Design a protein around this ligand. Structure first.
Ligand SMILES: C[C@](O)(CS(=O)(=O)c1ccc(F)cc1)C(=O)Nc1ccc(C#N)c(C(F)(F)F)c1
Lengths: 240, 9
């Protein structure tokens, strides 16, 4: 079980948002905290992806590309499992110091998106998603979105991706499970995209609403996210 | 890019 050992070995631990939970729940406070959490989680995603089997074969620019594109989806997917395990999908467990209840969902101004995410969090339950299936679905999420006119070494990418699907095959060992898990991974992408849209817009209007973006995230949002939004970069979907 | 310099250090 050499592959599965690695995934669990490299799984990130708890990341806090640094939230001030004595502050009354203002939109700006919440989103200035979500953004900081973004960056914290990004850092942990960089460390993880590097210790990822084969990841290092990718040309370096593809590594950076691929992480920036997937970031949201990874954050979203993991968050849904965290929320499931920790609080049984009652609330959104972004971090320990940052759990969204219905009021916070309304307050963030991303209620529709949140309900989507809460729903997915329930799915880890409705499907009895093993922790081994989750870990491996989450790896496959990093290979689930690419610029349409391809990466620098697209072939080394396609190998890696088709090999992460072989691993999921073994974690499923039965044809019917694959239907559902692949359906579950597709659900992430619409959500990632709504988040991406919201986030992007927020950056533009951010000086007028007092929301605070860490340098690195503002750059990513202004440089990579537009490509997703402009259709240059597109998720790989199993279905439809 | 600040992500580039961070990514490779
Ligand atoms: C509003 C935002 O901060 C945007 S961001 O983190 O700066 C960001 C910017 C660019 C990206 F490609 C992805 C994320 C955000 O979506 N934060 C955030 C933080 C933590 C988690 C978790 N878990 C999530 C979400 F995955 F659940 F959406 C979202």
């Amino acid at each position: 079980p050499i592959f599965l050992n690695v995934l669990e070995a490299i799984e990130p631990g708890v990341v806090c948002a640094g939230h001030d939970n004595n502050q009354p729940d203002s939109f700006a406070a919440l989103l200035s905290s979500l953004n900081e959490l973004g960056e914290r989680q990004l850092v942990h995603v960089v460390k993880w992806a590097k210790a990822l089997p084969g990841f290092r074969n990718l040309h370096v620019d593809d590594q950076m590309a691929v992480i920036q594109y997937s970031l949201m989806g990874l954050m979203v997917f993991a968050m849904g499992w965290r929320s499931f395990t920790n609080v049984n999908s009652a609330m959104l467990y972004f971090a320990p110091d940052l759990v969204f209840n219905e009021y916070r969902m309304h307050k963030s101004r991303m209620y529709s998106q949140c309900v989507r995410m809460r729903h997915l969090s329930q799915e880890f339950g409705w499907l009895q998603i093993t922790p081994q299936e989750f870990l491996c679905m989450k790896a496959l999420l990093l290979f689930s979105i690419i610029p349409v006119d391809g990466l620098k070494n697209q072939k080394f990418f396609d190998e890696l991706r088709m090999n992460y699907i072989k691993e999921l095959d073994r974690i499923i060992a039965c044809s019917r499970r694959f239907y559902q898990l692949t359906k579950l991974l597709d659900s992430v992408q619409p959500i990632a995209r709504e988040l991406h849209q919201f986030t992007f817009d927020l950056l533009i209007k951010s000086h007028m609403v007092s929301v605070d973006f860490p340098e690195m995230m503002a750059e990513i949002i202004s440089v990579q996210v537009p490509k997703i939004l402009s259709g240059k970069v597109k998720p790989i979907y199993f279905h439809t | 890019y600040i992500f580039d310099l961070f990514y490779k250090r």
